[PDB]
Design an enzyme around this catalytic site. Structure first.
Site, mmCIF file in Angstrom:
data_model
loop_
_atom_site.group_PDB
_atom_site.id
_atom_site.type_symbol
_atom_site.label_atom_id
_atom_site.label_comp_id
_atom_site.label_asym_id
_atom_site.label_seq_id
_atom_site.Cartn_x
_atom_site.Cartn_y
_atom_site.Cartn_z
ATOM 1 N N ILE A 179 0.861 -1.210 0.000
ATOM 2 C CA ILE A 179 0.000 0.000 0.000
ATOM 3 C C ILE A 179 0.886 1.246 0.000
ATOM 4 O O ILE A 179 1.829 1.294 0.785
ATOM 5 C CB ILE A 179 -0.881 -0.062 1.313
ATOM 6 C CG1 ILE A 179 -2.000 -1.110 1.060
ATOM 7 C CG2 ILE A 179 -1.484 1.279 1.608
ATOM 8 C CD1 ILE A 179 -2.692 -1.552 2.332
ATOM 9 N N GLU A 220 -2.294 -8.928 2.672
ATOM 10 C CA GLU A 220 -1.814 -10.215 3.160
ATOM 11 C C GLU A 220 -2.788 -11.349 2.834
ATOM 12 O O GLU A 220 -2.397 -12.472 2.501
ATOM 13 C CB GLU A 220 -1.368 -10.250 4.684
ATOM 14 C CG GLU A 220 -0.366 -9.180 5.014
ATOM 15 C CD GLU A 220 1.085 -9.495 4.494
ATOM 16 O OE1 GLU A 220 1.237 -10.447 3.663
ATOM 17 O OE2 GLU A 220 2.064 -8.867 5.000
ATOM 18 N N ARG A 228 -2.407 -12.369 -0.662
ATOM 19 C CA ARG A 228 -1.191 -13.197 -0.921
ATOM 20 C C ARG A 228 -1.363 -14.612 -0.446
ATOM 21 O O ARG A 228 -0.664 -15.506 -1.017
ATOM 22 C CB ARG A 228 -0.025 -12.542 -0.177
ATOM 23 C CG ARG A 228 0.414 -11.249 -0.777
ATOM 24 C CD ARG A 228 1.401 -10.612 0.234
ATOM 25 N NE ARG A 228 1.880 -9.340 -0.337
ATOM 26 C CZ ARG A 228 2.263 -8.309 0.407
ATOM 27 N NH1 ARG A 228 2.163 -8.460 1.720
ATOM 28 N NH2 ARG A 228 2.720 -7.163 -0.114
HETATM 29 C C1 LIG Z 1 15.278 10.248 3.961
HETATM 30 C C2 LIG Z 1 14.897 8.826 4.362
HETATM 31 C C3 LIG Z 1 14.266 8.130 3.146
HETATM 32 C C4 LIG Z 1 13.107 7.222 3.587
HETATM 33 C C5 LIG Z 1 12.224 6.321 4.518
HETATM 34 C C6 LIG Z 1 12.401 4.860 4.039
HETATM 35 C C7 LIG Z 1 12.336 3.640 3.106
HETATM 36 C C8 LIG Z 1 11.568 2.524 3.837
HETATM 37 C C9 LIG Z 1 10.890 1.561 2.848
HETATM 38 C C10 LIG Z 1 9.720 0.789 3.505
HETATM 39 C C11 LIG Z 1 8.788 0.263 2.407
HETATM 40 C C12 LIG Z 1 7.633 -0.593 2.930
HETATM 41 O O1 LIG Z 1 6.361 0.055 2.753
HETATM 42 C C13 LIG Z 1 7.557 -1.846 2.093
HETATM 43 C C14 LIG Z 1 7.377 -3.029 3.051
HETATM 44 O O2 LIG Z 1 8.356 -3.651 3.516
HETATM 45 N N1 LIG Z 1 6.073 -3.289 3.289
HETATM 46 C C15 LIG Z 1 5.514 -4.346 4.178
HETATM 47 C C16 LIG Z 1 4.455 -5.118 3.367
HETATM 48 O O3 LIG Z 1 3.773 -4.186 2.514
HETATM 49 P P1 LIG Z 1 2.293 -3.598 2.883
HETATM 50 O O4 LIG Z 1 1.520 -2.383 2.491
HETATM 51 O O5 LIG Z 1 2.482 -3.776 4.344
HETATM 52 O O6 LIG Z 1 1.831 -4.829 2.034
HETATM 53 O O7 LIG Z 1 5.038 -6.131 2.493
HETATM 54 C C17 LIG Z 1 5.657 -7.252 3.271
HETATM 55 C C18 LIG Z 1 4.665 -8.435 3.190
HETATM 56 O O8 LIG Z 1 4.564 -9.181 4.405
HETATM 57 C C19 LIG Z 1 6.016 -6.811 4.755
HETATM 58 O O9 LIG Z 1 6.866 -7.773 5.453
HETATM 59 C C20 LIG Z 1 6.594 -5.312 4.783
HETATM 60 O O10 LIG Z 1 7.132 -4.785 6.117
HETATM 61 C C21 LIG Z 1 8.405 -5.175 6.524
HETATM 62 O O11 LIG Z 1 9.154 -5.902 5.857
HETATM 63 C C22 LIG Z 1 8.894 -4.630 7.920
HETATM 64 C C23 LIG Z 1 9.940 -5.490 8.671
HETATM 65 O O12 LIG Z 1 11.119 -5.642 7.846
HETATM 66 C C24 LIG Z 1 9.385 -6.878 9.099
HETATM 67 C C25 LIG Z 1 8.888 -6.891 10.553
HETATM 68 C C26 LIG Z 1 8.974 -8.304 11.165
HETATM 69 C C27 LIG Z 1 10.271 -8.479 12.007
HETATM 70 C C28 LIG Z 1 10.727 -9.963 12.059
HETATM 71 C C29 LIG Z 1 11.608 -10.272 10.821
HETATM 72 C C30 LIG Z 1 10.749 -10.824 9.671
HETATM 73 C C31 LIG Z 1 11.174 -12.262 9.314
HETATM 74 C C32 LIG Z 1 12.019 -12.287 8.035
HETATM 75 C C33 LIG Z 1 12.391 -13.752 7.691
HETATM 76 C C34 LIG Z 1 13.761 -14.113 8.319
#
Ligand SMILES: CCCCCCCCCCC[C@@H](O)CC(=O)N[C@H]1[C@@H](OP(=O)(O)O)O[C@H](CO)[C@@H](O)[C@@H]1OC(=O)C[C@H](O)CCCCCCCCCCC
Ligand SMILES: *[C@@H]1O[C@H](CO)[C@@H](O[C@@H]2O[C@H](CO)[C@@H](O)[C@H](O)[C@H]2NC(C)=O)[C@H](O)[C@H]1NC(C)=O
EC number: 3.2.2.22
Length: 246
Positions: A71, A160, A163
């Site tokens: 999103i 989710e 997916r």
């Molecule tokens: C000047 C500064 C510049 C800018 C600011 C920064 C840039 C930051 C970019 C972030 C982009 C982010 O929106 C994309 C993303 O990742 N999204 C999550 C999900 O997308 P949704 O809308 O949530 O579908 O899509 C994925 C579907 O599930 C979901 O995982 C995502 O969220 C994350 O990845 C967040 C964390 O990384 C995960 C949190 C769980 C922690 C445990 C580790 C996970 C296990 C991994 C396997 C070993």
């Protein structure tokens, strides 16, 4: 565009919305009979508009990037709101341009950032159809801390569920009573990129994962997925993140 109304909603009408959402995402190929999301889409075509209506009929439009089901932002009356990330600022070039003002939310869209903003991990936030009615309501008027928890509910109950069939069924079970996600749900969310990649790499490796993926199962037990014969691949996963985007 696709739409969902919480007024009169039931497991059947939510399933129809999840089906519409999946069918709105373009693909050229299936891999192991799973739609493979495109590497890239240029211009405004990159974004799908989801119109969501709360129980009272008030509405937000959510912009979803069709390559990754992420999103980017949403429109609520005359105001647009976007994640503080480059992909979302890019989206704001194409969607909701007719909004009177554009607010950039004070976090990106990833789960870790949103959990920090919300003050709670996903494990502690109930989800379900009532929770989605609440999140729509919350997003109608700006409150950045309330919106982070609303967005964790919104992401899980739309993207989710699109997916993973298991996650869609978990929401259906919560049509009239919210409950925190099962550990299997959180596991699948976290593993979608991993899985998408391993399924694609199996294509020239006889169906075998280059690297096994660890998941938590429906019974709370910690399974290890090694090949495309797994139920996670034959029945559950519904969309694949292209490896060009991993
Ligand atoms: C000047 C500064 C510049 C800018 C600011 C920064 C840039 C930051 C970019 C972030 C982009 C982010 O929106 C994309 C993303 O990742 N999204 C999550 C999900 O997308 P949704 O809308 O949530 O579908 O899509 C994925 C579907 O599930 C979901 O995982 C995502 O969220 C994350 O990845 C967040 C964390 O990384 C995960 C949190 C769980 C922690 C445990 C580790 C996970 C296990 C991994 C396997 C070993
Ligand atoms: C492919 O996947 C299935 C897992 O779904 C594997 O079959 C399992 O084998 C393990 C061996 O330890 C057993 O514990 C399970 O009971 C089996 N389940 C089923 C449904 O068959 C299989 O090992 C994997 N095949 C390859 C070639 O790696």
């Amino acid at each position: 565009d696709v739409s969902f109304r919480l007024s009169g909603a039931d497991p059947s009408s939510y399933g129809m919305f999840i089906k519409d959402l999946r069918n709105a995402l373009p693909h050229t190929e299936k891999v192991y009979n799973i739609p493979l999301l495109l590497p890239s889409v240029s211009g405004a075509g990159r974004y799908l508009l989801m119109h969501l209506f709360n129980y009272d009929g008030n509405t937000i439009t959510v912009a979803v990037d069709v390559t990754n089901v992420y999103i980017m932002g949403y429109l609520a009356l005359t105001t647009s709101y976007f994640f503080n990330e480059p992909a979302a600022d890019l989206a704001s070039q194409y969607v909701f341009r007719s909004a009177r003002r554009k607010i950039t939310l004070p976090y990106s869209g990833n789960y870790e950032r949103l959990q920090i903003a919300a003050g709670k991990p996903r494990e502690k936030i109930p989800i379900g159809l009532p929770a989605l009615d609440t999140a729509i309501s919350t997003l109608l008027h700006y409150d950045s801390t309330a919106a982070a928890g609303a967005l964790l509910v919104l992401i899980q109950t739309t993207a989710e569920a699109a997916r993973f069939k298991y996650i869609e069924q978990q929401i259906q079970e919560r049509a009239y009573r919210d409950e925190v996600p099962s550990s299997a749900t959180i596991s699948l969310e976290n593993s979608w990129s991993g899985l998408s990649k391993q399924i694609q790499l199996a294509q020239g490796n006889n169906g075998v994962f280059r690297t096994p993926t660890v998941l938590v199962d429906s019974k709370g037990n910690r399974v290890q997925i090694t090949n495309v014969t797994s139920n996670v691949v034959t029945s559950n996963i519904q969309l694949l993140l292209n490896t060009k985007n991993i």
